[PDB]
């Protein structure tokens, strides 16, 4: 029936693009996961290094009393 194959059309087009919008999110999100994935590249960097500077700080201070 035309009322079926037709309703199907407007429904499928309202099914694919319904994924479009969703697809757009995976686009932006993915672009953000990598974007914010940069800060972590610095976090890991800073953290360990911050421990290096502090470690040298706790050492000198201890030897400054001995």
């Amino acid at each position: 029936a035309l009322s079926e194959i037709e309703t199907r059309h407007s429904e499928i087009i309202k099914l694919e693009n319904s994924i479009r919008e969703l697809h757009d999110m995976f686009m932006d999100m993915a672009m953000l996961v990598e974007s914010q994935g940069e800060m972590i590249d610095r976090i890991e960097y800073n953290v360990e290094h911050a421990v290096d500077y502090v470690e040298r700080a706790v050492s000198d201070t201890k030897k400054a009393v001995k």
Partner: protein, 131 residues
């Protein structure tokens, strides 16, 4: 009209499959990164605790010095359905992962400030012992 309503829709179903499948790959990469980024944080946590423990040792010592078309078409539908219902699988997983790391970062930011203020106190309590 039923000829251009089904076919076009078929070319439409094709777009769906690829769009989701091509996005799922990005989803994998996302989860793949979420896993790695998770380790990078489990390595940051070690710092927060390390810094708060060492600074406590510094202060003490410092203060010390101070003081068939509809058939295959329908077949694709069963595929789209199985993929979407699967898109949630990761969608949910990536959710827990985030909520997890997000919580871990909270403990970091907190301690981070406590350590920061402390390191500043040490610096100030260090420029007052010279001489």
């Amino acid at each position: 009209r039923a000829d251009q309503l089904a076919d076009e829709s078929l070319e439409s179903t094709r777009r769906m499959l690829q769009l989701v499948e091509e996005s799922k790959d990005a989803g994998i990469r996302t989860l793949v990164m979420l896993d790695e980024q998770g380790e990078q944080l489990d390595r940051v946590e070690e710092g927060m605790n390390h810094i708060n423990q060492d600074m406590k040792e510094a202060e003490k010592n410092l203060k010390d010095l101070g003081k068939a078309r509809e058939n295959e078409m329908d077949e694709n539908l069963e595929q789209v359905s199985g993929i979407i219902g699967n898109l949630r699988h990761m969608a949910l997983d990536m959710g827990n992962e985030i909520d997890t790391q997000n919580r871990q970062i909270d403990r970091i930011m907190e301690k981070a400030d406590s350590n920061k203020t402390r390191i500043d106190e040490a610096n100030q309590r260090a420029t007052k012992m010279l001489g």
